[PDB]
Design a protein around this ligand. Structure first.
Ligand code: HEM
Ligand code: HEM
Ligand code: 9OS
Ligand code: 9OS
Ligand code: H4B
Ligand code: H4B
Ligand code: MTL
Ligand code: ZN
Lengths: 407, 411
């Protein structure tokens, strides 16, 4: 019931007490581990509100204070009357920061306390959402000196008035299926693109078309908007040694801004809560570029390098992989756009983890997601035992809105 | 209950029904996943249902379930258990069991090979000298002059837990490690403790960087005895690089035969505490883990200097660059010397096919993603994108405590 995690490289054991406070299910049982599976009323509300307010008031050294009891009382009253309740600004900021702190799949959590929270609960229309989103993008991008941010739209009411950003990230490239049978652009984004076209987007049918926003306010039908091109910071990808690399026509955007998750704070649900940090190089160079069902450029790069692609044992894929990732980091650094390599990031996470164990009693972590997609065991997280469990406030996945939407 | 797994690269969906046969526990609960945790004297009471479960599986596999031979065997075993408190497996059952322990090993990426395993029955062994002879024979057979053949040698099962057969080595072939007074380590730091034990037991150590350890062998619960494997039986491969001529001067080599010797084999409730087994290497075990772990030989820096990489900032990816070149060298060297080895691309590709075959014909394939995914270039192998279900089936290979921590010394 009290658990130890060992680092097998350093021999440091840490003791987890925090897992006891876990509330949500993992998907695992005593007979089966599902660790690698990607996606495993007023009566319900108040204990959740209570559990949250208790941790909030504990955090400000005011546990068991009249202010604590008063607020608890106030919220309870508001739930009885209105069936929901409204978070104070302080509580919303605390909750958003703690959702990130609790994200067991996030390697960048050493940054969790430095998050700019934009309260957009006064938003009523998709045009308003667009304005708020543009402001977010500009603030977060900051001419390449990226700053973590989240923008929070009104909370779910009866579920038939949801605010949703239909896009999976604020900035992403379109995908088009060809008659030639191939895929042009990002294969990951074919279905969403089609939805944009159905709604009236005029597609430039290119390889790197920044997608338009499809924004849904108050459960109403979603609308299209184009992010001002001047707010979208992109990076041409070149290699520091290979002059030919620039001829591949590759570029990526600076701002990773996830827009399809659900933020849960104190039992309240924020279905529209786009947030952004900055990239770890491997997200672009390993996954975005080298995944088979993404841009899948390994073969092309391998050829320009003139490698023996006869036999897998020459490790030509592994060689091309490293060079692609060298280029990504080189390109962002050269243009002064914030990026972190997987060595620096995992090293930071180990220090964060030690901090959290020391000051919080633990740190929920998903090893399958925390270990980078290349060079795994030469990063310190590979050798670190981790415990995965679910704490609230939390970021949750939610269904894509089109499967849900009563048009 | 049906469980689905999805491959996120191909959208192939498999359905698992085999997990229903899982009996043993995982370590996880509905509140916590222990998936990344390395490690999360029986009564006749529990023994017969375990024997019976196994024998039912055996007889089904040979299409003789419910047969007179089946029923007679169950009867025979029950009598033997109730009169002698244990039982003996037939040679056929032992072979079936060893192959299935391997088939069931969720951490093993090499399981496409499971049905091809040479089983050496050493249950007639009585002394450490006897164990030494059996192990020499296993090494020579398995090595086969570089054309590696998977094999397992099985010593007598546990009785009262006071007469255990144990191989004290973690692997039959492994390099010594010596802690120096200045805090540095010579040889393999992984084996410092075992090396000290060998030295204490009488081993005269050469004190070099790649000294093959002596065998420390325990028969019938007696104090263990030291033997040296004949050098002519130890196949080694000097490591060189196909393009880089300075790589040979790093002075690296490795042994050809990975032969794990500290696991416990459970078949039908019987415990085989000494069951050394061997296959062949996947290149990354040597090139990534053995050579590049900070707590092992740790050669990344030296290699990186010789390549003249920019080592001032991690974002140059110098470590990643050196790591690939080292792994190329390992594969090149083994192939050049005609010693069996498999690269991580081939091995993971083969495992996916194995896993799919197992889903269709067996209803599942328990797999530990954390261990299956190779320690370099993870997501450019197909296993990274494959969802897996981890659960425990018997027969199985289990961890056991190191014998120096439990052994009662006779003196
Ligand atoms: C500031 C720099 C940040 C870095 C370097 C970083 C790094 C990462 C990486 C590499 C992943 C794995 C993503 C993938 O493989 O698809 C991840 C996941 C995640 N991040 Fe962070 N992150 C950062 C900021 C943030 C912020 C500001 C938030 C929220 C406020 C956040 C919340 C999450 C969540 C919820 C996941 C899991 C997403 C999922 O399950 O799909 N991250 N992060
Ligand atoms: C034939 C070629 C084989 C290959 C290429 C192979 C490959 C591997 C690899 C790479 C690992 C991970 C080891 C580590 O990272 O420490 C592993 C684990 C394992 N292998 Fe295989 N293997 C082979 C044969 C065998 C055989 C013959 C057996 C038993 C009869 C076996 C049983 C196991 C077991 C029980 C594990 C888990 C070890 C642990 O938990 O520490 N393997 N295998
Ligand atoms: C459920 O997971 C999937 C299912 C299908 N396709 C793709 C996925 C991957 C999910 C994408 N999550 C992607 C993400 C989330 C948060 C981040 C925060 C910072 C950062 N640098 N990158 C992030 C990247
Ligand atoms: C619980 O075990 C550990 C814990 C911490 N450090 C190290 C270890 C040792 C893990 C060693 N597994 C070692 C092994 C076992 C079977 C194999 C079969 C074939 C093969 N090519 N390699 C194997 C390699
Ligand atoms: C099947 C497996 O869970 C899946 O491929 C996971 C593996 N680890 C990952 N890790 C990160 N950071 N991101 C991912 O999308 C995935 N995908
Ligand atoms: C902490 C973590 O479980 C540990 O480092 C694991 C990770 N995956 C592994 N995978 C393999 N094949 N071998 C290992 O030793 C490990 N070590
Ligand atoms: O020096 C002794 C070690 O080799 C030994 O303790 C192993 O690490 C252990 O047996 C796990 O394989
Ligand atoms: Zn689990």
């Amino acid at each position: 019931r009290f658990l130890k995690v060992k680092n097998w490289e350093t021999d440091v054991v840490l003791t987890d007490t925090l897992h006891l406070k876990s509330t949500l299910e993992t998907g695992c049982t005593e007979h089966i581990c599902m660790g690698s599976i990607m996606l495993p009323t007023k009566d319900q509300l108040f204990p959740l509100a209570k559990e949250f307010l208790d941790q909030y008031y504990s955090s400000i050294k005011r546990f068991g204070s009249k202010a604590h009891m008063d607020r608890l009382e106030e919220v309870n009253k508001e739930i009885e009357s209105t069936s929901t309740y409204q978070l104070k600004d302080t509580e919303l900021i605390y909750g958003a920061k703690h959702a990130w702190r609790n994200a067991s799949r996030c390697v960048g959590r050493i940054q969790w306390s430095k998050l700019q929270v934009f309260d957009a609960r006064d938003c009523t229309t998709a045009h308003g959402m667009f304005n708020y989103i543009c402001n977010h993008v500009k603030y977060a991008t900051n001419k390449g000196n990226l700053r973590s941010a989240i923008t929070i739209f009104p909370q779910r009411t009866d579920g038939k008035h949801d605010f949703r950003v239909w896009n999976s990230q604020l900035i992403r490239y379109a995908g088009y299926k060809q008659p030639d049978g191939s895929t042009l652009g990002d294969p990951a984004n074919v279905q969403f693109t089609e939805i944009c076209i159905q709604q009236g987007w005029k597609a430039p049918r290119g390889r790197f078309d920044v997608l338009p926003l499809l924004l849904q306010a108050n459960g109403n039908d979603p609308e299209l908007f184009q992010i001002p091109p001047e707010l979208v910071l992109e990076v041409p990808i070149r290699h520091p040694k290979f002059d030919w690399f620039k001829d591949l026509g590759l570029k990526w955007y600076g701002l990773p801004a996830v827009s399809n998750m659900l933020l849960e704070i104190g039992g309240l649900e924020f279905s529209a809560c786009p947030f952004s940090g900055w990239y770890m190089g491997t997200e672009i160079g390993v996954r975005d570029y080298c995944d088979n069902s993404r841009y899948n450029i390994l073969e092309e790069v391998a050829k320009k390098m003139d490698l023996d692609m006869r036999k897998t044992s020459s490790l030509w894929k592994d060689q091309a992989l490293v060079e692609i990732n060298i280029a990504v980091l080189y390109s962002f650094q050269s243009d002064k756009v914030t990026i972190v390599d997987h060595h620096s990031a995992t090293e930071s996470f180990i220090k964060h983890m030690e901090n959290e164990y020391r000051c919080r009693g633990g740190c929920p972590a998903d090893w399958v997601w925390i270990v980078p997609p290349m060079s795994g065991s030469i990063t310190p997280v590979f050798h670190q035992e981790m415990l995965n469990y679910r704490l609230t406030p939390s970021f949750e996945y939610q269904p894509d809105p089109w499967n849900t939407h009563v048009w």
